[PDB]
Design a protein around this ligand. Structure first.
Ligand SMILES: O=C(/C=C/N1[C@H]2CC[C@@H]1c1ncnc(NC3CC3)c1C2)c1ccccc1O
Ligand SMILES: [Zn+2]
Ligand SMILES: [Zn+2]
Length: 116
């Protein structure tokens, strides 16, 4: 069945929490993840990463009712972070940031879906 308006709003709330999240230094960790470089700019990315995704795309998929559940949303966010861990050097800031955004997501999903 179609997504209730509340579900769509929870999804945007979760993702806005992730995007707007700032660490204890005030850096918005999501910045580099918003939009992938194009296939022309970084063909190496697409050679490696089978299922590219960025936060622009996730926002698109919320808007267009493509996630059937908050579990589907989570899967796409875990994919984004997995792709970042796959492409970027272990221990780089981008790798480390992706780990944190996993947690931020799981925290936000709980807070938003359980009311709290
Ligand atoms: O890994 C992601 C981004 C990667 N990079 C960003 C910053 C460092 C690295 C990079 N390496 C070389 N050329 C770079 N840019 C130049 C223009 C070619 C980029 C853009 C990513 C981004 C969004 C969602 C998921 C992701 O895995
Ligand atoms: Zn619609
Ligand atoms: Zn994998």
């Amino acid at each position: 069945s179609p997504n209730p308006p509340k579900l769509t709003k929870q999804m945007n709330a979760i993702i806005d929490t992730v995007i707007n999240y700032k660490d204890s230094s005030g850096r918005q960790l999501s910045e580099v993840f918003i939009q992938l470089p194009s296939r022309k700019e970084l063909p190496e990315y697409y050679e490696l990463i089978r299922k590219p995704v960025d936060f622009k795309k996730i926002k698109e998929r919320i808007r267009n009712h493509k996630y059937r559940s908050l579990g589907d949303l989570e899967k796409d966010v875990m994919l984004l972070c997995h792709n970042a861990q796959t492409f970027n050097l272990e221990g780089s800031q981008i790798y480390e940031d992706s780990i944190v955004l996993q947690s931020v997501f799981k925290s936000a999903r709980q807070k938003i879906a359980k009311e709290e």
